[PDB]
Amino acid sequence: NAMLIIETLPLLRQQIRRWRQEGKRIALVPTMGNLHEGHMTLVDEAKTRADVVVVTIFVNPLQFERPDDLAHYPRTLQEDCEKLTRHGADLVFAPAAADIYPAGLEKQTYVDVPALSTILEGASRPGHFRGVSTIVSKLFNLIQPDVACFGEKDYQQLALIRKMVADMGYDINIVGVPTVRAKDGLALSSRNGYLTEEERQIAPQLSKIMWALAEKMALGERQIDALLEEAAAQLLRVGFTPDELFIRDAETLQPLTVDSQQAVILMAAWLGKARLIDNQLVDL
Amino acid sequence: AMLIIETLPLLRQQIRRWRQEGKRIALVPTMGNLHEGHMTLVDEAKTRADVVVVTIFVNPLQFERPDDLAHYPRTLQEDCEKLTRHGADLVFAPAAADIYPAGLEKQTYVDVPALSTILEGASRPGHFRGVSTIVSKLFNLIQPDVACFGEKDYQQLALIRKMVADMGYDINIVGVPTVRAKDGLALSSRNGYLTEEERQIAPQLSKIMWALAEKMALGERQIDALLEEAAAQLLRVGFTPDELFIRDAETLQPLTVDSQQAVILMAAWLGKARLIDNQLVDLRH
Numbered sequence A: 001n002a003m004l005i006i007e008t009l010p011l012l013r014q015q016i017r018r019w020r021q022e023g024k025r026i027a028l029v030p031t032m033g034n035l036h037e038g039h040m041t042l043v044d045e046a047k048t049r050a051d052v053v054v055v056t057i058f059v060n061p062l063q064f065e066r067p068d069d070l071a072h073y074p075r076t077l078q079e080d081c082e083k084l085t086r087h088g089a090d091l092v093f094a095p096a097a098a099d100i101y102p103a104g105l106e107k108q109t110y111v112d113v114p115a116l117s118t119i120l121e122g123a124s125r126p127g128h129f130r131g132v133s134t135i136v137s138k139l140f141n142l143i144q145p146d147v148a149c150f151g152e153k154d155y156q157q158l159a160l161i162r163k164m165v166a167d168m169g170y171d172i173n174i175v176g177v178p179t180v181r182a183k184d185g186l187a188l189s190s191r192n193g194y195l196t197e198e199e200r201q202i203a204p205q206l207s208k209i210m211w212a213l214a215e216k217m218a219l220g221e222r223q224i225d226a227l228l229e230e231a232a233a234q235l236l237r238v239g240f241t242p243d244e245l246f247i248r249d250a251e252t253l254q255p256l257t258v259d260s261q262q263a264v265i266l267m268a269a270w271l272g273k274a275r276l277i278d279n280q281l282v283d284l
Numbered sequence B: 001a002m003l004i005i006e007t008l009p010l011l012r013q014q015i016r017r018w019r020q021e022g023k024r025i026a027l028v029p030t031m032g033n034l035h036e037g038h039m040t041l042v043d044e045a046k047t048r049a050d051v052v053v054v055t056i057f058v059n060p061l062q063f064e065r066p067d068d069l070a071h072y073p074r075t076l077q078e079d080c081e082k083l084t085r086h087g088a089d090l091v092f093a094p095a096a097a098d099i100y101p102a103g104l105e106k107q108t109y110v111d112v113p114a115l116s117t118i119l120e121g122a123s124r125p126g127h128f129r130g131v132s133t134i135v136s137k138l139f140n141l142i143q144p145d146v147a148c149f150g151e152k153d154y155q156q157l158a159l160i161r162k163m164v165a166d167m168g169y170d171i172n173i174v175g176v177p178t179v180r181a182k183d184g185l186a187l188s189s190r191n192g193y194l195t196e197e198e199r200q201i202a203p204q205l206s207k208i209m210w211a212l213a214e215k216m217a218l219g220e221r222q223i224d225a226l227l228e229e230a231a232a233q234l235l236r237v238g239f240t241p242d243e244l245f246i247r248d249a250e251t252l253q254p255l256t257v258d259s260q261q262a263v264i265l266m267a268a269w270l271g272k273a274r275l276i277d278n279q280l281v282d283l284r285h
């Protein structure tokens, strides 16, 4: 069937009710548009896990702590829909912010996930993760999916949503999808477009340094402090300006303990105009 | 044929089965120690769906006073026996360790800031965050078509309505009028906290509220004077009033020329019990 494109809440409601009454398993892929091949692998994964796949395109003002950053977020609906139809999305839901938050942002009911919202990336971004957990909860309530796909690329987001889902009683399988990489290993991001030609040839070093760190851990290394210092050194020597680096429990993002079963390595570093990031799971 | 379920996986099994059977589901959230008011919620729910799910959970997240949580009555077998006669289809009665397996310090929460910090929310800081969090969780677990709440907790109902509108829940929210003892006292599990002597004083709250409502029926509109008098009368008979309010029944804001219906919102301590009541007042003439 032709892909449906819905902008209003009443028309969305009609359709979701129909699918729920028909017994269709529903997958949800939340996005903010400006889609690339990474997003398309989310849709591909969703397709294997459900009867119908809903993809949202919504630049969420509640998660932008600088309100002007909304003004500058790329809007490319036609291009996004071209891609989505080709990957078999059944419904694209692309609402106006006025329809999602008609009572404004300050007095909008919100969902907050303690600790995961305020550590690491949340520490310098008060209110960002509240906006994420709120919109995702709302979309879950609107669309009633059995499965929802998120990129591992945005790892703290993924961990946050997993916690929310466990805590709030959602019967939803949260699927983390690995990042698409270039043949040279560079993780796919809209950010990559901001690199110069010379910078694009340095960029693959972030994953290589990460994977060197992960290999040491696979054998048994656990002096987290030293591992990270090394990696910041190497980032500098090959032309990045490192940001802070971390190795944390994959579920809580807290420092590893003897009960932690999985770690996540969290890399971030500047290359000219772009702050690039990557991550890697380590079985402990 | 009423079912009792305690665990979250068993609840989901049953909710899935009913949806496969094409059933519409009504939800009635409670904290147990059920009375006739609760039975009237169940009766109303049965007229609005095929199956009625009643929850019984003393929710620690909404008790801002540890002594109040400690003393809240627990009478599950009695509760269940009453519900079987009113034809509830399922009682869901979870343990706190399953609802909040790691406790409350890191538990994800839902806040409705439009209503959580004013009026009763000002008198009970932290309380409404507990309510919206558990009700959201129950909605997510059950996915009812309709959910029924008592108008005795008037601001709670407004708060849940706001949460549903804000959060995109496809759930019809129904309010059911307060059921009272023959002597006028609003039924409440909290009434059990009263001594025998206090129980004979307790009807005065309704009487004072109704006397205020009568003055407003006659055209009185000086709210602070009306409330000062009600507070004086409560003190006289042995209550300690908490903050009293008269607001627009729809918005809970101060009355304006456009208001058509007021709500009197009463709260008062009698011994160890903190009792509430309310009354709608038609302002039209």
Ligand SMILES: CC(C)(CO)[C@@H](O)C(=O)[O-]
Residues within 6 Å of the ligand: A030, A031, A032, A058, A060, A063, A132, A135, A136, A154, A157
């Ligand atoms: C999950 C998401 C759609 C929520 O707005 C957004 O944070 C995103 O695309 O990363």
Ligand SMILES: CC(C)(CO)[C@@H](O)C(=O)[O-]
Residues within 6 Å of the ligand: B029, B030, B031, B057, B059, B062, B131, B134, B135, B153, B156
């Ligand atoms: C709605 C309710 C069950 C939520 O815990 C509770 O506040 C109550 O019964 O008043």
Ligand SMILES: [Cl-]
Residues within 6 Å of the ligand: B062, B063
């Ligand atoms: Cl309470």
